[PDB]
Amino acid sequence: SLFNDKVAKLLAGHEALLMRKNEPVEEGNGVITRYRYPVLTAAHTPVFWRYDLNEETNPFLMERIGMNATLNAGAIKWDGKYLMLVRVEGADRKSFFAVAESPNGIDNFRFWEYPVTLPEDVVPATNVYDMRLTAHEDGWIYGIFCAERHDDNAPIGDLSSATATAGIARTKDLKNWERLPDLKTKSQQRNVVLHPEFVDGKYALYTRPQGGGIGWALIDDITHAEVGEEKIIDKRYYHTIKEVKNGEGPHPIKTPQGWLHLAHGVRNCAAGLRYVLYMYMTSLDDPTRLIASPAGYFMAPVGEERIGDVSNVLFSNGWIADDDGKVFIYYASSDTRMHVATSTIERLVDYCLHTPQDGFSSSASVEILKNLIERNLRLMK
Amino acid sequence: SLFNDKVAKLLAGHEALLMRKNEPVEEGNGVITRYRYPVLTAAHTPVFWRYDLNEETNPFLMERIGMNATLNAGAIKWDGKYLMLVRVEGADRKSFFAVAESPNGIDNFRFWEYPVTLPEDVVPATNVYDMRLTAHEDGWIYGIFCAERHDDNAPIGDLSSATATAGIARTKDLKNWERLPDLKTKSQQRNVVLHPEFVDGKYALYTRPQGGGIGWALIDDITHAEVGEEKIIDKRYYHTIKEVKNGEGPHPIKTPQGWLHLAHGVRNCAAGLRYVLYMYMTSLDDPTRLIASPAGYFMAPVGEERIGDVSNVLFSNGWIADDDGKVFIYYASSDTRMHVATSTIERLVDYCLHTPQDGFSSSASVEILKNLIERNLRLMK
Amino acid sequence: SLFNDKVAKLLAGHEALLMRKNEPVEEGNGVITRYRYPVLTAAHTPVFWRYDLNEETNPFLMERIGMNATLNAGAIKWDGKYLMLVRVEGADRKSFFAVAESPNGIDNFRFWEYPVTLPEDVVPATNVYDMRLTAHEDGWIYGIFCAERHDDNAPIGDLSSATATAGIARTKDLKNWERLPDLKTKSQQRNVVLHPEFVDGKYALYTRPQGGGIGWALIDDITHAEVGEEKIIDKRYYHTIKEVKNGEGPHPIKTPQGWLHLAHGVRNCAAGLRYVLYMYMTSLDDPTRLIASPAGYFMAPVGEERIGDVSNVLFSNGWIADDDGKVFIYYASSDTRMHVATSTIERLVDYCLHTPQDGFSSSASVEILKNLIERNLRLMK
Amino acid sequence: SLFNDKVAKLLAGHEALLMRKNEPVEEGNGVITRYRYPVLTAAHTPVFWRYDLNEETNPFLMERIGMNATLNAGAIKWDGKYLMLVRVEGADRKSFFAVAESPNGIDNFRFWEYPVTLPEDVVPATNVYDMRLTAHEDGWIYGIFCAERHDDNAPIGDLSSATATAGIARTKDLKNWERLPDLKTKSQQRNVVLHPEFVDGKYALYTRPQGGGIGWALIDDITHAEVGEEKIIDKRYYHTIKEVKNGEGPHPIKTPQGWLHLAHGVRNCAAGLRYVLYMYMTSLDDPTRLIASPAGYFMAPVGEERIGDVSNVLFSNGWIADDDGKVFIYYASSDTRMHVATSTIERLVDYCLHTPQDGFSSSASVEILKNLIERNLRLMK
Amino acid sequence: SLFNDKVAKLLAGHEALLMRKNEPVEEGNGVITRYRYPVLTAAHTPVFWRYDLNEETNPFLMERIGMNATLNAGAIKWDGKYLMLVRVEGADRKSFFAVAESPNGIDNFRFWEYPVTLPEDVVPATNVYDMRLTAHEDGWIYGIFCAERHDDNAPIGDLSSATATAGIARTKDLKNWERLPDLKTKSQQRNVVLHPEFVDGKYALYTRPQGGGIGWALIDDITHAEVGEEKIIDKRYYHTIKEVKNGEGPHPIKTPQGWLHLAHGVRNCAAGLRYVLYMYMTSLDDPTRLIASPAGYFMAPVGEERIGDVSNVLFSNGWIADDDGKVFIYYASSDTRMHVATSTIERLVDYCLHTPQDGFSSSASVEILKNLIERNLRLMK
């Protein structure tokens, strides 16, 4: 029948998209390798999420639930597979979480048939987004996320003012989730991330109070989490890529040289807010102590990445490092699609350690550059 | 001569562009079909609008009047032809109206040789734009549009503050237009649209006071139009595609199931304001009563649509429904170019009736999705 | 070795990019001709600016200093060569100046091996940008630029508020620069440009106080420059391409018909600020007196130009006119890359003189258009 | 499992290829419409024809039986479907027959899971090819094909000299085939085709003895087929597209205006033999009598059709005419792949009836052309 | 200097071409992997082979010696590099030999600055071509090639009749070559190839007398080479890919399973002669005894390979097998350009051993196919 042929074609076209082999982009900077195709787009959501496949109830075979974007995803290496904890935004402008898994980490990501069911905390949330997964040494996988609500105290007709808390859930299977109480805090918090080890026998959170920058907060009890003392670890600075805002991405990776961090930085321009990624390192002995601050951005929007629902944005709240040192960086572009970039622990550490630090002025930048040119011209002689 | 050959080539290249056959995009959602090419761009304006073709007065053969964009167009089925009432914006940043006609509704749109001459109302307007055409049962074609003026009461050096009224003109031929008095109103009005039938023996306007949403106002005399009582029909809602603003597009289409509406909704993001299209239905018995509110957006910017003078925008103030049920939706992208999308009355009604309503939260969205997945997995067994 | 082969390939790929022949875009308006490729991108900076080429110190061969953009460039015809004074922005978000030279003016631009070393004035600057070069009749080449500093008087956590002065440097070789004192002024100044001739035996600056528009200021002593009397030459106007801001681009070109100017104009839209280029002419007898104001924009973003770090922007602070009348216009798109467009003095003068002036309303625009259509239809008879 | 993922990708890529929607080629001559994609290629053969899918016996997952080409196909409308009787050539250079079916006639052709099993005649054949299907009024489907054997008369070392008979098989289901005795004949026969009606109560064959052209032979008993008298119906002519050889393609279509034929014509050139398609018509009253001989070729190799294993060839032995007059022409290009072209009975009859006949010389061709030009120029005034 | 810039651009474009990274073709049959780009083309010859770079003697900078094709190349692993012994054909239609080397075997092949100087034998040759290199156990590298001369027996006016001998040269450095006497033989020989081991204490040649197929001849003294007894190892067969001619390609690779051979097979068609590659294996114990004859062709012209000076041809006289079993197959397409395809010894042996043998008829091919289908469908259940 015409209907059944149409359903067959949707399924076949979908499988072809899902199985497409990704290819590295040859042109790169030696630090990261980009890939030709996104790892996930709205079109990667299953056909049976969007269409009602029953001819009786959907004779025109049209989509009943539109999917708009797949973005800002957490990530975890899980039972030999590479998993994203995807933020999926529907046509209805709400986001929900959904696991997608790949055997190799650069392609063939497929969504689990059901997305994530996340119980509400005592106060219901309107939107939830941007989950960072942490396999904590206490044996749980934590998901720390943003739970946003309308600010019910706003001028009449203001339907845009919102508040947001750090949501905390934990799971041992990524299917059955327990919702712990939202983080208690004096300042608004976003980009809250769980450090994977106890510090002074306490849970440690990366925070972003709103604000000096990315903060560090020790938490006695994750099941009754409340920020007391808060210490800024990485600061915003005038005329850097992290002038207006910054925030931790995924939880850092432990290396013999220190904690390796991936964050985002914001500045304002004539087109709005511009988001790029940057890296920094902190000490193993004292994770609150910066030991590497390479200048500038680590990644910024290139090509297709520049354009989407919220253009001029790269964002990451997920990456995976394999035992062999290979690193898979999962980053959204323009709040619309997910990409992968690959590097190694050794390369990322070298990049952090030997990219000159920002001296904070045109003159300082020129002098660092002139020094490198001078060394190179001597060599090329 | 070299000059005459150059003129010949401009004309021939122009005819080739105008006559290009459009092709549907195969990949779609079953609700609407997009097309490969815009129906109108600035390059579609006639050569004799832009160049002085006289070698005596333009020996270099350069354009004397630049055309920048063709956008937010009204539409009407007219004497067997498919017509857009185009908003054409010159290089000078002023807009004017111009009729363009096509024999088939998806391509070969050509501008009438002269654009629209629209008399001023008592108070002259600086810019006029976004006309909605209504073949009213009183036998006139009305054009309701935005007439914008500088707010002559602004801080010194403020050359941006403006006010805008609903302009009302009517015609029986689309060439000779009578300008009626601007709509009198307490609130600023934009996106004002004439309903094509008398209601309680009065003219009925869709309004957008600035604001709760899209309003309904009965008008005793269209030749002395003044808003008295105003009733909101479709509301803005927090964390939907219509959070910050919304507005009626073209006048709705009457179906046996009710009035079928096309509107735009706005939200703010890091890149500015984001405009998408959405649909809703109201009752035949009481056009002020909503009977269908499918969740989310109906159309959002895809691909080339995402980019233009005002990126991240879809807008529509025109569509045509033929007697056979075929619907032609004329929509601008990014304030730069006009596109067509096609559907049918039956499909648009089904989309409005069976796309689940927005339950207004991530949890609600997940539950609707999980229900559809469950039905589908059972079927696919 | 693998390393040496990798270095060889970087160098060879770089030379191939640098030597690529540009091609004109056939489709144009008869005023300017665009070209297929940018004249400069971040990828045009030398390999030895970005990589440490020593295997001992960079065994992974990764970039040590990222280059982000090449934009808003000055320009000068210099010893038979076509030179841009490029604003180069590093990954660190600081800009510095660098000379790039081409034998033909449309391609094969190559950076001088070292960028520009510019001494600080008494008060150090954080960022310097957008230099306009003027070969003044006093025998110096002046560079007038923007020197930006953080406004150290801002609310706590405000790391974005800044001030900016007009920096003044001069040189006779473009390598050794003398820094004169920053321009003293009551209003903030940007887009300050040196007129190439003494006027009433004084230095003359184009200014942009922040503001009525582009101003004119006579300066007794360029080595102790201070604005006293200031006169607006070209005004901002409501609902034009220069509504919110405007500013002089490069210094004007002298023609027998008057001074030929290139400027930028800004308006606000839903996507942010939109920058286009426009032209005007002033009198030889009195350079403060406008004699030509063609309506609208001269150039606006087309295609690839629309997208970049700061989208929806064209900017120019440099052009070259050869003795034969050929004009090379160097313009940035989207704060990301440099382009060239070509015309002639005769064509640019004709464009300024015979593009109708803006009558400032939709009605006025329609009437000018209807007049041209009428002339053309008569001719085409 | 890497292997299982690999098999899954093979099947998925194959289904995507099979299901691809064909699209009409816009540019045409008003007689036939070509399509963007072939209807069949070697890649269309089932994955399970080529690969051993068992990891135990094929751990490297390589092809065990290469498929080289899908060409010269018969065709039949069968149980509401559009069927090709494909000549499939393996890498081993032998051809075999296989049914492929499509729901619509222009795409989604899929091979039946098993190819055709054809019993040998008394003398076994080395290669069998080019089957023409005829649903005869006697209630059988006949396939008349070429059965080729090495020539025993050949000298030692001559492994190329071959002979061919017309094979005759019949079936009621296209799965179980009865092989009747090879056509007995004094001359070598190829391109033998069964007319679908008895004529004078006898079976009628189109023949091609080798040679005046396409012949007509009445046969008393198809189960003991032997040509006696043969009449030439369509002749070869010096300096036409059918100079060296010609041959009937599929059996002709009956129209109210006569029998509509499709054939191939051959000429020799510097690159070898060049094959094109041509048409002619014969009388209903006397199918041996020509009633239309449009000049020249009907179709010749265009674009991708020009190249293959045997370049510069179009060949057809299959077409389908639906009740509504729509015609689907299945033609191979360059002995490599199968294409479809569409027309209607009315258009094909008009083409045959009103394309001027070949007057056989440059001067005659010029006179026909000048007469048409004269008519058109008079019209265009 | 315009000239010097032009020379610099020639060298830069050439280095870019030479250094281009090759990429594997994704779609393959599991036996061999093709690559996106040729390894060599006429354009790969050094700029200084073609242009006179002296402005005094070549002021227009045009080519003084055109290069037409790079084809039928021998190959050898040499001092850790991958070398082709290229047949380079000039515009003058003579071929000569030239070494080209690559660090990796799939790209970055570069010609040695001088081509091969090969001393004539007693009777000078007009053209020399198609060299097979054999690193023989006697410690020499032999090149056995074709040496062609005009046939003196030809009639006046016949300038095409030619004769060919097997040329024999040897070297220890691929620069200084010793020419041994041409192979003495009763029949014309071509595709003569030296086996790399003594057999019964004698040199062993693969021969192709003209003709039963590929022959085997033991030679006492390679410095006075004369064929006595010849045994045919691989035969031509009617209606296979090796019907008209066949010939050994490069010398075979020794594997634990036997000698692995690569050869070419020829058949005639309407477009001329069609050349494909095929494989066979012979016994280690007795290299004259066939132990594997996979049916059909191993590789045939695909895509761009189909077209060139002599279309419809693949040809190979060179391949390299590394210690790790990786195999690089160097094959010309259409006598015009050189390609690489990769496999492994294990895969090639499996291909030869488990591709069913040719049963020599359509019915046999069908039976082999139906057996595989049956196995797969049972599996797929």
- Write out chain D residues lying below 8 Å of B23, CB-based: 23
- CA-based nearest distance E66→chain A, Å: 33
D20 reaches A (C-beta below 8 A)? no
Crossing angle of helices E2-19/C2-19, nearest 10°? Answer: 130
Structure tokens at E237: 């067969």
Q: Which residue of E has its CA nearest to A20?
A: E26
- The strand pair at D337-344 and D33-34 is best described as antiparallel
Query: Do residues A339 and A330 touch, judged by C-beta distance below 8 A?
Result: yes
Chain B residues touching A149 at Cβ < 8 A: none
Q: Looking at chain C from residue 151 to 210, which residues have their Cβ under 8 Å from any Cβ of chain A?
A: 157, 159-160, 162
Question: What gap in Å lies between CA D21 and CA B26, rounded to an integer?
Answer: 9
Give the distance from CA C375 to its chain's centroid.
38
Q: Is A36 on the interface with E (CB under 8 A)?
A: no
- Interchain CB distance below 8 Å, E12 and C16: yes
For A198, phi then psi, to 5°, come to -60, 145
- Closest to E16 (Cβ–Cβ): which among C5, C13, C103? C13
How close A184 comes to chain D (CA, Å)? 46
Closest CA to B300 of B323, B326, B277: B277
- Partners of A15 on chain D (C-beta within 8 Å) are 12, 15-16
Contact at CB, B125 and C361, closer than 8 angstroms: yes
- Find where tokens 């488990």 sit: E354
Contact A96, A88 (CB under 8 A): yes
Let me know: does A174 contact A79? Beta carbons within 8 Å.
Answer: no
Contact D21 B21 (CB under 8 A): no
Find all residues with CB under 8 Å of A85, minimum gap 6, and list them: A73, A74, A75, A76, A97, A98, A99, A116, A131, A133, A143, A174, A318
Taking the C-alpha atoms of residue A242 and residue B32, their distance in angstroms, rounded to an integer, is 42
Structure tokens at A29: 């900077």
The sheet carrying C81-90 orders its strands as C67-78, C81-90, C95-102, C110-111
**Phi, psi torsion values for A353, nearest 5 degrees:** -80, -30
- Residues of E within 8 A of D160 (CB-CB) are 238, 243-244, 267-268
Name residue, tokens 């915003």. Answer: A236
Cβ-contact A82, A88 below 8 angstroms: no
Chain E residues with CB under 8 Å of C103 CB are 5
Choose among B22, B63, B14, B23: nearest CA to B43.
B14
D21 touches chain B (CB under 8 A): yes
Chains C and D physically touch (3 or more Cβ atom pairs below 8 Å): no
Chain centre distance of CA D63? 29
Helices A2-19 and D2-19: crossing angle, nearest 10°? 130
Q: What CA–CA distance (Å, rounded) separates D168 from C160? A: 89
Residue D222's nearest CA partner among D200, D204, D208, D207 is: D204
The torsion of the CA quartet E361, E362, E366, E367, rounded to 10 degrees, works out to -30
Q: Tell me how many domains chain A contains.
A: 1
Contact yes or no, A with C (3+ CB pairs under 8 Å): yes
* B41 three-class SS: coil
Name the 3-class secondary structure at D349.
Answer: helix
Contacts of E84 (CB under 8 A, 6+ apart): E39, E40, E73, E74, E75, E99, E100, E101, E109, E318, E330, E338
A36 contact C CB<8A: no
Neighbours of A179 (CB within 10 A): 16
Residues C7/C8/C13/C18 CA torsion (nearest 10 deg): 100
**Residue D271 sits at the chain E interface (C-beta within 8 Å):** yes
CA A273/CA B303 separation, integer angstroms: 22
Quick one: tokens of A50?
A: 């969007």
Q: Distance from B303 to chain A by nearest Cα, in Å?
A: 9
According to DSSP, the residues that pair with B83 across neighbouring strands are B76, B101
Q: Inter-chain contact A21–E26, Cβ cutoff 8 Å? A: yes
CB-based contact A244 C159, cutoff 8 Å: yes
Closest Cα of chain E to A21: distance in Å? 9
**Which residue of chain D is at minimal alpha-carbon distance from E299?**
D91
Chains B and C touch (3+ CB pairs under 8 A): yes
Three-state DSSP class for residue D106:
coil
What residue numbers bound the domain in which C256 lies?
Answer: 1-381
Nearest to B64 among C237, C271, C355 (CB): C355
What is the spatial distance between Cα E144 and Cα E167, in angstroms, rounded to a whole number?
6
Pairing of strands A81-90, A67-78: antiparallel
Q: Which of C197, C125, C214 is nearest to C168 (CA)?
A: C125
Nearest alpha carbon to residue E287 among E203, E214, E216: E216
CA angle (C270 as vertex; C264, C272 as ends), nearest 5: 40
Residue E372 is given by DSSP the state: H
Strand order in the sheet with E314-321: E33-34, E337-344, E326-333, E314-321
DSSP string, D136-180: -TTSPEEEEEEEEEE-TTSPTT----EEEEEEEEEESSSSSEEEE
Could E238 and D92 be called an inter-chain contact, meaning their C-beta atoms sit closer than 8 Å?
no
A214-218 contact pairs (CB < 8 A, 24+): A214/A246, A214/A247, A214/A248, A214/A263, A216/A287, A216/A288
Q: E56 CB contacts (<8 Å, ≥6 apart)?
A: none
- Do the chains contact at C160 and A211, CB–CB below 8 Å? no
Q: Rounded to whole angstroms, what are the CA distances from A87 to A40, C266, D139, D267?
A: 11, 37, 63, 65
Q: Is it the case that chain A and chain B have 3 or more CB pairs lying under 8 Å apart?
A: yes
Give how far the C-alpha of residue B5 lies from the chain's centroid of Cα atoms, to the nearest Å: 39
> In 3-state terms, what secondary structure has residue C76?
strand
Rounded Cα distance between A334 and A286, Å, is 35
What sign has the CA pseudo-torsion D170, D175, D176, D182?
A: positive
Q: Could E21 and A26 be called an inter-chain contact, meaning their C-beta atoms sit closer than 8 Å?
A: yes
Distance from C-alpha of C339 to C-alpha of C301, rounded to nearest angstrom: 11
Q: To the nearest whole angstrom, how far is the Cα of A156 from the nearest Cα of chain B?
A: 9
Residues from chain B that touch D26, judged by Cβ atoms under 8 A, are 21
Q: Do chains B and E touch (3 or more CB pairs under 8 A)?
A: no
How many angstroms from the chain centroid is the CA of residue A288?
A: 21
Residues ≥6 apart with Cβ < 8 Å to D108: A5, D18, D19, D102
Nearest of B246, B213, B242, B252 to residue B230 by alpha carbon: B213
In this complex, how many residue pairs, one in chain B and one in chain C, have their CB atoms less than 8 Å apart?
A: 163
In DSSP terms, A183 is beta-bridged to none
CA D288 to chain centre: 21
Chain B positions touching C240 (Cβ under 8 A) are: 92-93
Cα–Cα distance, A71 to A84 (Å, whole number): 10
Q: What's the distance, Cα to Cα, between the start and end of chain D in Å?
A: 74
Burial class (CB within 10 angstroms; exposed 0-12, middle 13-18, buried 19+) of A235: middle
Answer yes or no: are the C-beta atoms of D82 and D105 closer than 8 Å.
yes
**Which helix (H) or strand (E) covers residue B194, if one does?**
strand B193-194
- CATH number of the domain residue C97 falls in: 2.115.10.20
Instruction: Report the amino acid identity of residue A333.
Output: S
Q: Is some CB atom of chain C closer than 8 A to the CB atom of E15? A: yes
SS (H, E, C) chain A: CHHHHHHHHHHHHHHHHHHCCCCECCCCCCCCEEECCCCECHHHCCHHHHECCCCCCCCCCCECCCEEEEEEEEEEEECCEEEEEEEEEECCCCEEEEEEEECCCCCCCEECCCCCCCCCCCCCCCEEEEEEEEECCCCCEEEEEEEEEECCCCCCCCCCCEEEEEEEEEECCCCCEEEECCCECCCCECCCEECCCCECCEEEEEECECCCEEEEEEECCHHHCECCCCEEEEECCCCCCCCCEEEECCCCEEECCEEEEEEEEEEEECCEEEEEEEEEEECCCCCCCEEECECCCCECCCHHHHCCCCCCEEEEEEEEECCCCEEEEEEEECCCEEEEEEEEHHHHHHHHHHCCECCCCHHHHHHHHHHHHHHHHHHHC
Q: Is C150 on the interface with A (CB under 8 A)?
A: yes
Residue A1's contacts (CB-CB under 8 Å, 6 or more residues apart) are: none
Cα–Cα distance for residue pair A128/A199, rounded to 1 Å: 28
CA–CA gap between residue A10 and residue A6 (Å, rounded): 6
Residue C40: DSSP 8-state: B
Q: Count of CB atoms within 10 A of residue A371's CB?
A: 12
* Number of other residues whose CB lies within 10 A of the CB of residue D381: 5
Whether A297 has its CB under 8 Å from any CB of chain C: the answer is yes
Residues 6+ apart with CB under 8 A from B11: B47
Alpha carbons C14 and C22: distance in angstroms, whole number: 16
Shortest distance, CA C24 to any CA of chain E (angstroms) = 20
CB E370 within 8 A of CB E116: no
DSSP-derived secondary structure letter, D284: S
First to last CA, chain A: 74
Identify the sign of the CA torsion C200, C202, C203, C205.
negative
**Do residues C73 and C340 touch, judged by C-beta distance below 8 A?**
no
Here the tokens at position B214 are 């899209």
Reduced to 3 states (helix: H, G, I; strand: E, B; else coil), residue E215 is strand
φ, ψ dihedrals at C206, nearest 5°: -80, 135
- Look at C275 and A270 and tell me if their CB atoms are within 8 Å: yes
